[PDB]
Design an enzyme around this catalytic site. Sequence first.
Site, short mmCIF file in Angstrom:
data_model
loop_
_atom_site.label_atom_id
_atom_site.label_comp_id
_atom_site.label_asym_id
_atom_site.label_seq_id
_atom_site.Cartn_x
_atom_site.Cartn_y
_atom_site.Cartn_z
N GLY A 1 0.74 -1.30 -0.02
CA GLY A 1 -0.03 -0.10 0.03
C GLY A 1 0.78 1.37 0.01
O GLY A 1 1.93 1.36 -0.60
N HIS A 2 0.28 2.21 0.48
CA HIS A 2 1.35 3.46 0.61
C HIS A 2 2.28 3.22 1.58
O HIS A 2 3.50 3.80 1.33
CB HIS A 2 0.36 4.48 1.28
CG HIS A 2 0.84 6.00 1.09
ND1 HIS A 2 0.06 7.20 0.78
CD2 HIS A 2 2.12 6.30 0.69
CE1 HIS A 2 0.84 8.34 0.50
NE2 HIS A 2 2.07 7.63 0.33
N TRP A 3 2.12 2.62 2.88
CA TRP A 3 3.18 2.62 3.95
C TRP A 3 3.87 1.55 3.85
O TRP A 3 3.68 0.55 4.57
CB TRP A 3 2.26 2.84 5.18
CG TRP A 3 3.38 2.91 6.59
CD1 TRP A 3 4.49 3.58 6.84
CD2 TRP A 3 2.90 2.19 7.80
NE1 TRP A 3 4.70 3.32 8.01
CE2 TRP A 3 3.78 2.49 8.48
CE3 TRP A 3 1.81 1.30 8.03
CZ2 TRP A 3 3.92 1.91 9.88
CZ3 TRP A 3 1.63 0.75 9.45
CH2 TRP A 3 2.87 1.17 10.33
#
EC number: 3.7.1.14
Lengths: 288, 288, 288, 288
Positions: B266-268
């Site tokens: 995902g983003h993180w």
Amino acid sequence: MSYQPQTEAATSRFLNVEEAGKTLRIHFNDCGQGDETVVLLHGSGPGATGWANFSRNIDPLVEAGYRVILLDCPGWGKSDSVVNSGSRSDLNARILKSVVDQLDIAKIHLLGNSMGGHSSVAFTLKWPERVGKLVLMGGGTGGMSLFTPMPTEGIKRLNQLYRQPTIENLKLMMDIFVFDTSDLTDALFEARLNNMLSRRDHLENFVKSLEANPKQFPDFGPRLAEIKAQTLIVWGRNDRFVPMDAGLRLLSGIAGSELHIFRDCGHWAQWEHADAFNQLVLNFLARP
Amino acid sequence: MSYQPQTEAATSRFLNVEEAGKTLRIHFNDCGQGDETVVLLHGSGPGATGWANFSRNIDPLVEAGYRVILLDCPGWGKSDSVVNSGSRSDLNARILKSVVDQLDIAKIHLLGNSMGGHSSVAFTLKWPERVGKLVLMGGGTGGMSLFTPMPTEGIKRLNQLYRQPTIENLKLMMDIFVFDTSDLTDALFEARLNNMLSRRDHLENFVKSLEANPKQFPDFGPRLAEIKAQTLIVWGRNDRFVPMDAGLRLLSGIAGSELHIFRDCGHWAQWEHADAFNQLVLNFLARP
Amino acid sequence: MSYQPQTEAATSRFLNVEEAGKTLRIHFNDCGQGDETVVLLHGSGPGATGWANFSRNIDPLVEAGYRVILLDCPGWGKSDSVVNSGSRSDLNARILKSVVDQLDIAKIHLLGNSMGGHSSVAFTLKWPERVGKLVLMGGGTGGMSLFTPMPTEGIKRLNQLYRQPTIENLKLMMDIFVFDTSDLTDALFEARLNNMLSRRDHLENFVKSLEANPKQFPDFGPRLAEIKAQTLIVWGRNDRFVPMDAGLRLLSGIAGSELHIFRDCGHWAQWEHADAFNQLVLNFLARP
Amino acid sequence: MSYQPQTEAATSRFLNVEEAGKTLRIHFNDCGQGDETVVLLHGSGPGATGWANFSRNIDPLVEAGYRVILLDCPGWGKSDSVVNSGSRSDLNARILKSVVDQLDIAKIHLLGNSMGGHSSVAFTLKWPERVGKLVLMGGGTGGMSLFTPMPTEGIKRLNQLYRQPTIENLKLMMDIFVFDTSDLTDALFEARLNNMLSRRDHLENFVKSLEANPKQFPDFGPRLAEIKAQTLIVWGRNDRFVPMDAGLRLLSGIAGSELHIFRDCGHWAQWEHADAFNQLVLNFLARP
């Protein structure tokens, strides 16, 4: 003599056909007296009706002299409800072949939106000699997108709508579904809500069929080279239900394909720019 | 003896920076005493702190002997709240220049995240002498994506969460934020929400800054060729906050780049695959 | 009662401009007496007069009633030879503003191909008032491509041709340009060859300007949003000189752009498809 | 003691296979005695051999202690010549299955390059139980590239080289392969030249195979979801023989897939960055 507007009730007829050893009654709308005929297929929207989807486009085709047939696919609208674990496109193609056999015309033109467009492609594969010209919008092949993650938010919201029918949820899915919300009117909201709540059987059947088979549109990549007729693909950049890249794949597949992209257009393009789309499709049809 | 896990309480430090003729207090953490040094930035999330973002990464860096400096930008954590009308990234760069000048370190490695990554790139543009290496995770360039619509859904959810912070919008944002929710625990939720409820001035300042100017991150594309230091990028495929295509743009600019992508991410990114990310970054750093 | 196509000799006109304290003679063609004025910009191909590129398209436009000004930028044809340290974009923009100021026409519609397209964009940036409608053919934005290695082989063969002027190099150049080489005739080969042989001075000026600046066409990315006029973009999928993906980037910048892509087209779109392109452009211009 | 670098003559082995009711003799090289086994497959270059492509990588693999076997596909090296009007991938799958059955190892890890990489994918589908770990370099899937015209530069020059053999085209091919030709030495040139001139039969068989059947490698798209083992894909950005996008497609196919891209690297990736590629591959294999 100026062409008079048409009404869905006026053009409504039904036909029963035998398929897979079972009877199925399909509603359809035929208008115009022209020799050349054009087929229209609706999307996969909740309570979507073939006449409802193409409200703007029905006219220029009939003034141009084309006789128009709108097919209400089984499992939607007035057609009988059905549960199918198999491919929706294959079933739609079989039903279309049956109805055209009853109507007894050989060469037809196809214009299909979303799911119907998928089915449209399927038809041209497995009875190629019938179709004359092909137009697609927002579909043509169901497969993983290259850059935009799947499942997209639009599909999740649509499944939310099917699982629990609610007017506010309908407002949400309309708002995400169309880029320009100002054109949206409460009349469409109430008509769509009434249609979708009236037929609970279609909704529950769709839910059960989705549970039965995770995938409804198989990949058609390796066979795209088989198509030979001229094709045109229209698409919207800000479409959120299906990413742009899918259309690019189709642009590779068909020999004569020409793509046309709008900068700020939602999934449902024919509404956004009715005049430009109508003139382009009419010119394509008139193109020798 | 094994290097003990670091504690922010023992490693807490504060510094004064004069920006725009105004005194500001900045919080940071310093660990290790080795000659080689590195700076760690933080994301743009609600109440995001470098310690929360980099819990898993903080140990191996100290283990390798690198001196580590976790930096907190103004507008988050214990730093003074500030309202911005111009470019955030340049302001962060100026503050980082002040703090490193007070630390008077010649050679420094930068590893930035999301908006923090932005800052890093901007920093590297102005002062190539100071920077030695670059590692960028999920950001670094401001621009419109090729195939993904803007504004993306993730930043929309982040903005509506800032409009009114609450537990359920936090749950929704966290669900969309990370690919897997199984390993997720409620301790992170409680820590994040207590950091949120600790200060509201940061949230209101962010909202007024955002409504002051729609864009706070500039486009560094045309000059991006100026960077001479070798760099590495880590990215997430299923990330919805910033599309993958923008990341590809960075790859084209710098002479020595290497792009790395995970599919189920995902983003993180650093938290989801801590072992692989740590191994890759340590190998890149030790590379002569 | 269609009027027979005009000849270059009757339509040749000469103006004088002063730039950087130098005197330049500009040779162009003007046809039609209509109120609406459309400016045509030549391609970047060696020895490519503006009339050569647009031989097919002149007749429909003048028949529709549009006044046409076909321009030859300095460095080609019968215009004075020059060497520029700066970009071609701003230079051609200034020259075109000067020539229209002598012709004192309030508003123009720009059609640009390759180099001119680049300059066309620059024009719209810094004199927005004069331009209302913009059409691009396979160019108009600098900057390197995301998915295509550079230098792309088309540019490489172009520079090779500039270094070795010979007939077989022209044959290979034509091979990469057009998807189907059958349509070309020996008359075009001999005309282009003698045209490019007439003026060597253009060749030396262009090459030493090439050593003057490695990159001659700047990227307009950050400023791309400043354009307010509607735009149409035509592109080729098999184009090798300029990659297809760059076109998509243009679609991002413009407020209301429309992208049209042909499946089997090279750099030279207007010649290969005549009826479709003429009809599309005429409809777009007539459309408000 | 230092582990001795390996020699071709000592490690050369010849085994027999039945295919299509015919007896074929295959040449390979065996190294190491570790229980774990890794199979290396060569590329599609004229006169290329398994040992030549992996000269820099073979040593660290046995230094770690893994057993390794270099395989020469039919039509290359000292193996018996063959003509294939059908797919190459299945044929190489059959040959590798037969040779590993004779060598009787239960678990094997595959590393492929270009055509071999494609074949490797096929193998994982047929006997998924055997493949433990999987790494690909520059290929694995057929089909039209989305953003790059076909046939591309390298494949066209490759067809030219097979049609007529010479040394100047050999320099041209090496120039297209490698980002920087300064590293490469004429010793490799003469080795490849004598190798390809020694066996005209392979050249003739390749030419006849291509002329008989246009598409050598099929598309494996729809079934890509069937692979469950972890994969590592390594690619070069300036690749001219097969564009970048194909790699991204594989990034969608495999659930646990991992992508790595070099900014300035040619098709023959492993030679250009020996240390980084070796370290990455050892990390991937050692990871449990």
